[PDB]
């Protein structure tokens, strides 16, 4: 993807479920059908107005007492040209907002294309054979946040490259408070 | 004093334990080094046999209770998963290394310099080893990749029919080649069938021109051989329509039970209709299929498979150019199928192979595909033959994919113990002995080669360091450098125009993993165990 | 205690070879003895408690124990061997024991396996060109040649006196299998031949059968027992009301909705009866169960119902008469009703009810009806039988021939023996070795015929040294040479080539173990 505009989701894409406990009664052999075209409609409407905006990448939040993201919505975003990354937990959103710059959004009436986070690189790599990486390279509005990738042959080797690293920054953490 | 309670050791008990335990797993393993020594076998505790030689599997299989060796193992099994050849040598170049520091730990020399001698060696080892390079568009190109799968496949169970092997390969990774952005030759593996499937020999194990599949027909009225067929990529279960848990059904008139009913039964037949409108012939499904929907497919003389992998199906909708279509909708509110996202097969046969059935698919008009079926005796060398087809394809890929070949054998390790002796002269500090370990560490190589092949082996190591002593001074004698190691009778000869072919990242890659484990491990003296 | 690894056991290679020598050369002598027409039949005990009786070489190794990785491995292919091809069983395990035999001297000698596998396939490559140069073409359509050949093959079963029929029951079992559907694709999958075991009666009274046989009865006996042209249909479906799968609740408040919704049943009852009835079925074939209401309605229109069928019978019952079952009663049609049938008569066999339906026009699925003693002669017959149609299939689908006994292997170890003059090297013992170990055959076959080895085998070596004399074999019945073209012993090329190639190649995965570790708890 070259230039995408990162979008950060906190609301589920599936059938719509209220807070107290919902039951359909069918009665006639239309409303069966009916139902299912309703459902469809709601998920193209929710699909066009997701798309209406112009983003590219979706960032969808884990949910655990519903699904966050069905088949037929996933398919209409794969249809749509659209990347959807549905595996974002909840303790890494204030990382995010604050090294993407993209304010959450968790209702589909407050998605405004102003509250999108302009994107120059959003692509993905592939290692030799250690699994996939998800990598994002280019801000508009970049924050005071960074990330540092520790390799190594050896888990432990990797955990001590860590723990060096770790103190190396407590050093010089102490060595700037100090100024002496 | 000092309240711990477990056993500890401090001094020089933990690493001569450290010691003779990487010398036991170097000794496990050195049985099925070259293409002279033989196979492995390992049973369980039920009676399931296993014969393999490849060096990880040997490794995995063994219950390892001990660090040091965990250490090794986990070494050689991310060996085999980066490159995919070269597993063993790795780790008995580590070994050697480690037995080689040992001495010189015991000499009241610090670790440090030891470790600073062997990575200034490593590097330059991995300099001198770009000056040494062949490229293989610059020569023949089609006679080196057949060498280098031949050698790939020198020791292993197919090592005299390597012939075809190596052409059967070549043809399968010239097929699988995939089209991206045009700027590099990428060569992605692990996307053929390799069935398994006992009965014929070896020679009769031929190249399919196309993707098998590894399932049956459905119903026994659809026929078994349709020319010019449509595939179709499904991925949703067809069977009989059920309501969700939130969706219940409270009957309150008796004249229209009978209607839903009928409704709940013609849903999937209308939706068979508008799907089957196109003119679709071969249907694949992911799920399974009723019972009621196969006499449809039945009556309009088509095929129904299902129980299909996602793998297989996404290969199968790449190579023909199909589209997995997970649902019906589309851009509006009503389930409509078209006709443009629809497959193109050739000719679709279900040949019975050995009682069990398989169906065949031919190449298409989009992409072409490749499908290996080996045939050995009983299971054992089934997965032999696999194993080796997968160890060649890996070998072929790195070599297509590096662009360059090194001649293997007991060439490459001498000139670099002879470049790193040369080299020690210069350095006057207390490194000088670490570059000369490293060196003498290399040679352990051709020692094992000519253990396992029960011949004189100080003699051909003494012929060997002359040669690349003669050849490294001299520059009238500079062609005597690719003289390599020939185990079938024990003289050298030309390793060069046709002996032995091997990659340059294979040999890189293993020896900055045996110096890192070398490292990472020399710097352990204390081991504290606690009591569960 | 520090350890390296926990039960944890390793050999060393000489011996590991030794003993897999060793157990590959017990298997061969104790396979040896179900040999040849003079050979005995065993009988085996298996733990469920039945007993095992019968005389094929793969039956006797299926039911031994072992724990040795060598005889796992010979038992192993020793069962894909009959899975291949289906004869050949007991002559690719002694093949495999004399080239150990032979082999294992030259192992001794300080000699590397890798020279010992390159000339055992440069052997077996000029073994196989040699066949494929022996071969002798034969006709399809003489029946009389493929009688013989047949006879031939099942001479050494019990069966030798009464193969003047069983010959001909397997050709005609073989001729109807063989159906071309769609395509240019002649499969010949044997699952439409149904070998049904009934005990009692003579040996002379089992004769195949023009259609199929159900074991089962009429729901009603007041429904017809013999029809002369019936029009038998087939169902898939359940004829009777039941629930649904969507979970539904049904919430009266009247009082005729009880009756209303008993009459709406009975209602829908008799419409699928009628569309039923509709098409004039006769014989109704389904795989699920039948009510009462349903019954009543087909007995009023004198129809025949059959309940509880299995898939395979149903399959053979659509493709013995001509129809296709269909799971939808509303969308029957005409073309799904099958007209082949010709005689459908329910007789008892031993307080046993059976509907034999037969005079088909031109069926494609044959039942043999086994007519015995107890169950283990029923299991041999049945065994024999299988033998018999596999070994005809094999013969139909690769119209070759090699002269039979032990003429092809003194030929073929003569023309290695004049082929190996020509090389050089060490290459040459190993290739004499293999030719010389071809002659295991003739001399277990003279062993148990007339235990003189040394003088028939020198006798069979002076009259194969000939260039005019390479169908010259020892008959199993006397004990003297006599030519192959006046005798009728022949075998098929395919069956041979499997069973050298099967033996070749357990020899060299057997020649290349040198370390046994055992002791992982598996994963
Ligand atoms: N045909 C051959 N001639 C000479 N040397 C060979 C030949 N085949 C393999 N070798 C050598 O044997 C060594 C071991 O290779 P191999 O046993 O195939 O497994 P690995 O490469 O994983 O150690 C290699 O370093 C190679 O140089
Ligand atoms: N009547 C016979 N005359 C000549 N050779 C025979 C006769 N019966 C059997 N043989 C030979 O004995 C060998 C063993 O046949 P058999 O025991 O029936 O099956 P298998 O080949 O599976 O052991 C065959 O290769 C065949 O050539
Ligand atoms: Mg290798
Ligand atoms: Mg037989």
């Known amino acids: 993807v070259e230039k995408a505009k990162i979008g950060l989701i906190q609301f589920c894409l599936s059938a719509p479920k209220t807070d107290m406990d919902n039951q359909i009664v069918v009665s006639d052999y239309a409303q069966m059908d009916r139902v299912l075209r309703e459902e469809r409609a709601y998920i193209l409407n929710l699909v066009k107005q997701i798309k209406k905006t112009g983003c590219n990448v979706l960032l969808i939040q884990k949910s655990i007492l519903r699904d966050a993201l069905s088949d037929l919505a996933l398919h209409f975003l794969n249809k749509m040209k659209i990347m959807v990354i549905k595996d974002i937990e909840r303790e890494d959103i204030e990382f995010i907002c604050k090294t993407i710059g993209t304010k959450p959004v968790a209702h589909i009436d407050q998605f405004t294309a102003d509250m999108l986070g302009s994107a120059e690189l959003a692509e993905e790599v592939n290692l030799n054979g250690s699994g996939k990486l998800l990598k994002i390279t280019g801000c508009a509005s970049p924050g005071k946040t960074v990330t540092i990738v520790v390799r190594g042959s050896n888990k432990l080797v990797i955990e001590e490259a860590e723990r060096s690293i770790h103190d190396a920054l407590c050093v010089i953490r102490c060595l700037v408070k100090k100024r002496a | ?532 | 205690v520090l350890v390296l690894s926990q039960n944890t056991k390793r050999e060393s290679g000489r011996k590991v070879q030794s003993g897999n020598i060793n157990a590959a050369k017990t298997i061969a002598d104790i396979i040896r003895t179900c040999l040849g027409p003079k050979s005995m039949m065993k009988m085996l005990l298996d733990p469920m408690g039945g007993i095992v009786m019968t005389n094929d070489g793969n039956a006797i190794l299926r039911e031994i124990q072992v724990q040795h990785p060598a005889a796992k491995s010979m038992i192993e292919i020793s069962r894909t061997q009959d899975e291949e091809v289906g004869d050949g069983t007991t002559s690719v395990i002694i093949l495999a024991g004399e080239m150990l035999s032979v082999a294992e001297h030259f192992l001794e000698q300080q000699m590397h396996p890798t020279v010992v596998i390159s000339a055992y396939r440069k052997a077996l490559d000029d073994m196989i060109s040699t066949l494929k140069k022996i071969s002798i073409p034969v006709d399809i359509s003489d029946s009389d040649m493929m009688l013989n050949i047949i006879n031939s093959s099942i001479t050494t079963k019990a069966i030798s006196r009464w193969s003047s029929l069983a010959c001909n029951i397997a050709l005609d079992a073989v001729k109807m299998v063989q159906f071309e559907e769609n395509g240019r694709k002649e499969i010949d999958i044997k699952k439409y031949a149904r070998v049904e075991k009934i005990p009692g009666g003579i040996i002379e009274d089992s004769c195949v059968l023009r259609g199929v046989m159900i074991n089962k009865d009429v729901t009603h006996p007041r429904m017809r027992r013999y029809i002369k042209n019936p029009r038998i249909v087939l169902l898939d479906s359940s004829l009777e009301y039941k629930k649904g799968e969507s979970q539904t609740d049904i919430e009266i408040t009247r009082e005729e909705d009880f009756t209303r919704i008993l009459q709406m049943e009975e209602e829908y009852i008799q419409q699928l009866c009628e569309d039923i009835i509709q098409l004039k079925p006769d014989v109704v074939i389904t795989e699920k169960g039948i009510s009462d209401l349903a019954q009543h309605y087909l007995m009023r229109a004198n129809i025949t119902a059959i309940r509880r069928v299995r898939k395979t019978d149903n399959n053979r019952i659509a493709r013995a008469c001509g129809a296709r079952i269909v799971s939808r009663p509303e969308e029957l049609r005409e073309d799904d009703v099958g007209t082949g049938a010709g005689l459908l008569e329910i007789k008892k066999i031993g307080d046993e009810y059976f509907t034999f339906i037969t005079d088909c026009k031109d069926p494609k699925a044959c039942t043999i009806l086994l007519r015995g003693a107890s169950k283990e002669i029923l299991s041999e017959v049945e065994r024999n039988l299988q033998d018999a149609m596999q070994v005809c299939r094999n013969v139909l689908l690769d119209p070759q021939l090699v002269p039979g006994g032990g003429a092809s292997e003194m030929a073929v170890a003569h023309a290695l023996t004049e082929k190996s003059k020509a090389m050089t090297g060490v290459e040459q013992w190993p290739y004499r070795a293999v030719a010389q170990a071809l002659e295991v055959i003739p001399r277990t076959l003279i062993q148990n015929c007339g235990a003189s080895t040394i003088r028939l085998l020198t006798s069979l070596r002076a009259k194969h040294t000939q260039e005019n004399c390479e169908t010259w074999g020892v008959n199993g019945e006397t004990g003297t040479l006599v030519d192959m073209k006046e005798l009728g012993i022949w075998e098929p090329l395919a069956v041979k080539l499997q069973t050298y190639k099967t033996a070749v190649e357990t020899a060299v995965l057997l020649l290349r173990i040198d370390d046994i570790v055992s002791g992982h708890k598996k994963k």
Not at chain 2, 141 to 154: E, F, H, V
Not at chain 2, 184 to 191: E, F, G, T
């Open chain 2, 1 to 532: 004093p000092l309240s711990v309670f477990g056993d500890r050791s401090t001094g020089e008990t933990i690493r001569s334990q450290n010691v003779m335990a990487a010398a036991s797993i170097a000794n496990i393993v050195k049985s099925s080094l070259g293409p002279v020594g033989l196979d492995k076998m390992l049973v369980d505790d039920i009676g399931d046999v296993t014969i393999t030689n490849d060096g990880a599997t040997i490794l995995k299989l063994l219950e390892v209770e001990h660090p040091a060796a965990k250490v090794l193992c986990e070494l050689a099994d991310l060996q085999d998963k980066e490159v995919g050849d070269g597993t063993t040598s790795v780790v008995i170049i580590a070994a050697e290394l480690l037995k080689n520091a040992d001495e010189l730990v015991k000499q009241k020399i610090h670790p440090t310099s030891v470790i600073s001698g062997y990575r200034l060696a490593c590097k330059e080892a991995v300099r001198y080893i770009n000056e040494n390079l062949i490229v293989n568009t610059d020569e023949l190109g089609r006679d080196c990749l057949i060498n280098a799968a031949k050698t790939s496949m020198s020791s292993k169970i197919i090592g005299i029919n390597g012939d075809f092997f190596a052409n059967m390969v070549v043809d399968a990774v010239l097929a699988i080649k995939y089209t991206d952005i045009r700027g590099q030759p990428r060569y992605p593996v692990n996307s053929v069938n390799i069935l398994k499937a006992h009965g014929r020999s070896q020679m009769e194990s031929m190249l399919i021109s196309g993707y098998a599949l590894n399932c049956v027909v459905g119903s026994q009225g659809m026929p078994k051989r349709i020319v010019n067929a449509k595939i179709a990529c499904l991925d949703f279960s067809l069977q009989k329509t059920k309501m969700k848990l939130g969706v219940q059904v409270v009957i309150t008139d008796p004249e229209k039970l009978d209607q839903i009913r009928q409704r709940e039964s013609d849903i999937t037949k209308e939706r068979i209709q508008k799907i089957l409108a196109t003119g679709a012939n071969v249907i694949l499904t992911t799920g399974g299929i009723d019972d009621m929907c196969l006499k449809y497919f039945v009556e309009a003389g088509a095929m129904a498979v299902r129980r299909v992998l996602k793998r297989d199906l996404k290969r199968i909708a790449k190579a023909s150019g199909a589209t997995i279509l997970s649902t019906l909708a589309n851009l509006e509110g009503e389930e409509t199928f078209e006709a443009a996202m629809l497959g193109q097969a050739e000719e679709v046969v279900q040949e019975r192979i050995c009682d069990d059935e398989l169906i065949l698919i031919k190449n298409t008009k989009a992409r072409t595909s490749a499908s290996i079926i080996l045939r050995g005796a009983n299971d054992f060398m089934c997965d032999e033959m696999e194993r080796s087809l997968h160890d060649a394809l890996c070998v072929v890929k790195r070599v297509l994919e590096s662009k360059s070949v090194v001649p293997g054998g007991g060439a490459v390790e001498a000139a670099l113990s002879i470049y790193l002796e040369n080299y020690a002269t210069s350095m006057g500090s207390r490194e000088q002995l670490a570059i000369a370990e490293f060196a003498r560490s290399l040679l352990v190589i051709p020692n094992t080669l000519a253990v396992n092949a029960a011949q004189d082996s100080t003699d051909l190591v003494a012929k060997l360091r002359a040669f690349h002593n003669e050849a490294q001074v001299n520059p009238e004698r500079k062609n005597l450098k690719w003289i390599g190691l020939d185990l079938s009778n024990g003289k050298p000869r030309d390793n060069k125009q046709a002996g032995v072919f091997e990659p340059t990242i294979v040999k890189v890659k293993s020896l900055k993993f045996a110096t890192e484990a070398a490292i990472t491990i020399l710097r352990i003296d204390d081991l504290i165990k606690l009591h569960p």
